[PDB]
Design a protein around this ligand. Sequence first.
Ligand SMILES: *C(=O)C[C@@H]1O[C@@H](C)[C@@H](O)[C@@H](O)[C@@H]1O
Ligand SMILES: *C(=O)C[C@@H]1O[C@@H](C)[C@@H](O)[C@@H](O)[C@@H]1O
Ligand SMILES: [Ca+2]
Ligand SMILES: [Ca+2]
Ligand SMILES: [Ca+2]
Ligand SMILES: [Ca+2]
Lengths: 114, 114, 6
Amino acid sequence: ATQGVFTLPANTRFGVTAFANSSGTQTVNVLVNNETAATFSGQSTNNAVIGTQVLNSGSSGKVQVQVSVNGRPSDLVSAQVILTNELNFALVGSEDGTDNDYNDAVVVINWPLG
Amino acid sequence: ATQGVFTLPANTRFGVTAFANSSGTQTVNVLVNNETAATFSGQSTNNAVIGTQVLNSGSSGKVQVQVSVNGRPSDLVSAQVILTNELNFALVGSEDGTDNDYNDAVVVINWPLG
Amino acid sequence: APAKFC
Ligand SMILES: *C(=O)C[C@@H]1O[C@@H](C)[C@@H](O)[C@@H](O)[C@@H]1O
Ligand SMILES: *C(=O)C[C@@H]1O[C@@H](C)[C@@H](O)[C@@H](O)[C@@H]1O
Ligand SMILES: [Ca+2]
Ligand SMILES: [Ca+2]
Ligand SMILES: [Ca+2]
Ligand SMILES: [Ca+2]
């Protein structure tokens, strides 16, 4: 199934942060209404934050996360989880290789903010 | 129920990162096997990373997250979620006030690393 | 610059 795609409440600010755990340089694109709105890049095998930013979900509320390594799309897994019917997490892991640890780029989206 | 307490597999490295969304200064403590292993501190209403670090879960695998504001424990909500039987997230939200947005300090634990 | 505890 499709992974890394999330419907947020419209016109809502949300946090997006990316971690890196690979010897490959991780590229993370975040699209809002099918248009790039953020891009992070970095290399780490120590879970270093390679980017963190706040975005707006716009009128559609459609958010898509993509991960590439040197132009190569990584396999994504994702899920959303909601806590006490209020705190939202949209979670993405990705695999750029063969060991399937799926942590090569970890992306976390949270809302509401403020 | 008890919240913010997670059993990780023994002797495993995990990432822990803490975000702020409150006019109150957030103090986050991370405990491993009941001993304070890490402490983050910061104030932000724009989801600023107020701390990030790698810890080892040690022999017990027991990790506990605590949140306080000016020395007042926030109310906690938590869950753990696992993707493709491999990528682990332990998620914490907290509430230091009355509005119940539960984002005042958001804490994300992830494993495996590397 | 009001500082407080508890
Ligand atoms: C390279 O062989 C694999 C790439 O980098 C490694 C250090 C490790 O993080 C692995 O999971 C990743 O796919
Ligand atoms: C006051 O400290 C309330 C505190 O900060 C607000 C700006 C808001 O973020 C609220 O959720 C939080 O409890
Ligand atoms: Ca991998
Ligand atoms: Ca990896
Ligand atoms: Ca609050
Ligand atoms: Ca808040």
